[PDB]
Symmetry: C3
Subunit: 314 residues, 3 copies
């Protein structure tokens, strides 16, 4: 199978500059070369160049609406392409607001996809419920069908079409949810595994249930949107919104190893890696290294080891 | 329901000065204000003023017997009072020796209560088995009924009446138990989940079993006496007796979230927080912050989020 | 029962000097004295003096073959001896290549023994599959019966006799396996629990299955060969090959506590402790301290506590 790396060095989805440097840091770490060592064919599409919308006045509270809306429109164009050629898209973030265009483009080709959102947040704030106008915490609001018309149209997002419903998404790792977001997920009945469910069940049983929930009836493509703050700050410290008591390095790898095993991975997002937020160079090395390790586990790298088929090592 | 914070800035239960500053640190951190944001009604009773017993000569090995005995007599007068008005008592420690008066007063109003003791120690050393005369490691000895008359009467504790039996208590997080204490718990058959049981079972199944053990037959009020060294030193470093290999931040919160769900929390003790033992300001912040987080989870704060009833956020 | 400490300050099994200092570090930490406090009789045999083979030319890729082969021939002589007097052998490493003579000598006296290998690696590289000629990553290749004649005879190892079969060994903690090694374990069908199985099952269920697998039919002596990099670098940083995402301090102790419980521990290897690889004195302290804690805990020290029999502490 083919893999296409897509760099989305974008940061207007939030106030902390630095996430744009994410793709570079991940490539600098040898992400592309390491992937080629796997059984997949790898093609690096390079980094997208995002045109900055001048005079991007805030829409009520929402900041940089047009810049974000445009960058995502361009990204969804690119993704919907690579998918068309039947390749697996891998988007290197920049902030999680780019999930809008990554999933949108993906859905255009595979309308029956389901999503597994690993994060410490929901990001289902609507332009009306955000305490801050930051879009990185609003991605899912723009995508769901149920939240259609429940908030005013935003400048630059008119091209967006709610592609997935509340039944097609599952959250894993939640631990920092605003009152508004919590109201939303409870009301729409969205399936989620907050850290307390993970503690109660064990990452093993959690993956078992997310699969039977999303793939029980129909086998469909899976879009894994991974926010790096999904794991505890001890493993991925260089992010903008670190929350204590998250997913361990082991639980994170377990999740990607399983998803690999389903053989249904299609889209993948490695978001929020911010190289400039590391207190020491080591914190940054730590962060990037796990991110790379996750990506790698999504495409086959097993902890138990790997050996090339047809090769008699004896 | 009503909540009553009661500060017990006491430290004579052990040699390291500093725990008396615990209540201040917890309030300074915004404990009371944060609680008011919960569905409970909060009333701060302030800090108790403990009269120092002059010429408090040690009883054999036991140090400051009268001072400790008196401070506890006063604290269980206060607790028995608030419980009488049907409010939930929350005691902010100093040292764990104050559990004597916290549980004594509580038992006066609710004689059928059961205890969940989170800690790395048992604190069931009797005045005859302690290697040190420190009372903070002897609380439970004075409470249980089975250990009645198995040790000489101590100066200042004649007011104490063994209120709970070996069947009404469960330990969680044990990892540093003296030979004597281990003899006692084995002999009296006290239910406990040391770190090895937690490793074997997983915090989820441990809470399941403590509940069926203590509430299987009769539903009764629960008194959660939380020693902050119950968690690993990496989360709560500012304590007097830190032991490595303890409960994680996640496991600690899991235990309080569950207890909240039983709807039977009646008394709570947040003990051993010593602000002066933090090697760096951050260590102290870390400690205080999770202590507050635990208290908050006992009264509803869920990791999956919270939303106010009857409020349509859309 | 009798215990015999045997120091193997050897390091030619790998390129990083320092592991020879392991035994001293462990003794300096009070390992022997602390053991005497247990119910076992302890005898320190001292450190073996290994004669250096001059002009030890590499065999193809394999480095220091003769020096390593000889040191192990001497070690297996010593071990086979103490076992013959019915005492439990405890080998303090240098590098894990010494497992060859530790297990060989042990098997001479107890041919029906089974092995529990805790490590992040397999070390089942054969002289033909190693990418580096380092022997510390080839121990198991020389011991297995199934891998007999699958590789050229190496200078100095002609005294070795494959003592255990693929059915007598279980790995726990794997997370860094070369393609060749992975081919080998899959082909020979060796039972293992990599970090993903530990995540899926929980250390509790893992130990349950390794026992039923190795002791289900016949109760036989157990040789625990512990590689200190088996735990995560956060607990045992001072090693030559640290791999992230390993066994926690708690899981490591759980494993030794269970093995003690079987009452079948016969041989024990505490390998790879390298005092010179600690970035700070604390890292080295940390490492040695848990190594000592594991050894203790192999011989009875329980987290729930210990009390001497027949002693009425009341
Ligand atoms: Mn996030
Ligand atoms: Mn996110
Ligand atoms: Mn304690
Ligand atoms: Mn305590
Ligand atoms: Mn190893
Ligand atoms: Mn090894």
């Amino acid at each position: 199978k083919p893999i296409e790396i897509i760099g989305a060095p974008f940061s207007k989805g939030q106030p902390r500059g630095g996430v744009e440097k994410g793709p570079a840091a991940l490539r600098k770490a040898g992400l592309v070369e390491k992937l080629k060592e796997t059984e997949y064919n790898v093609r690096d599409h390079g980094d997208l160049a995002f045109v900055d919308v001048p005079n991007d006045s805030p829409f009520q509270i929402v900041k940089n609406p047009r810049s974000v809306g445009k960058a995502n429109e361009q990204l969804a164009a690119v993704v919907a392409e690579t998918q068309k050629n039947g390749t697996i898209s891998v988007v290197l973030g920049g902030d999680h607001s780019m999930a809008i265009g990554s999933i949108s483009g993906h859905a255009r080709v595979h309308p029956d996809l389901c999503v597994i959102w690993v994060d410490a947040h929901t990001n289902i704030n609507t332009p009306l419920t955000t305490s801050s106008g930051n879009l990185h915490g609003q991605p899912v609001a723009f995508l769901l069908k149920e939240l259609k018309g429940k908030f005013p149209d935003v400048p630059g997002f008119s091209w967006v079409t709610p592609c997935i419903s509340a039944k097609d998404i599952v959250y894993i790792g939640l631990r920092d949810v605003d009152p508004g977001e919590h109201y939303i997920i409870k009301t729409l009945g969205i399936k989620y595994f907050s850290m307390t469910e993970v503690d109660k069940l064990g990452i093993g049983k959690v993956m078992e249930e997310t699969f039977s929930y999303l793939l029980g009836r129909k086998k469909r493509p899976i879009h894994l949107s991974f926010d790096v703050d999904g794991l505890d700050p001890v493993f991925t410290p260089a992010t903008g919104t670190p929350v204590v008591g998250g997913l361990s390095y082991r639980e994170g790898l377990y999740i990607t190893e399983e998803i690999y095993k389903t053989g249904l991975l299609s889209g993948l997002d490695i978001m929020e890696v911010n190289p400039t937020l590391g207190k020491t160079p080591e914190e940054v090395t730590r962060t990037v290294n796990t991110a790379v390790a996750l990506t790698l586990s999504c495409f086959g790298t097993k902890r138990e080891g790997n050996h090339k088929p047809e090769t008699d090592y004896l």
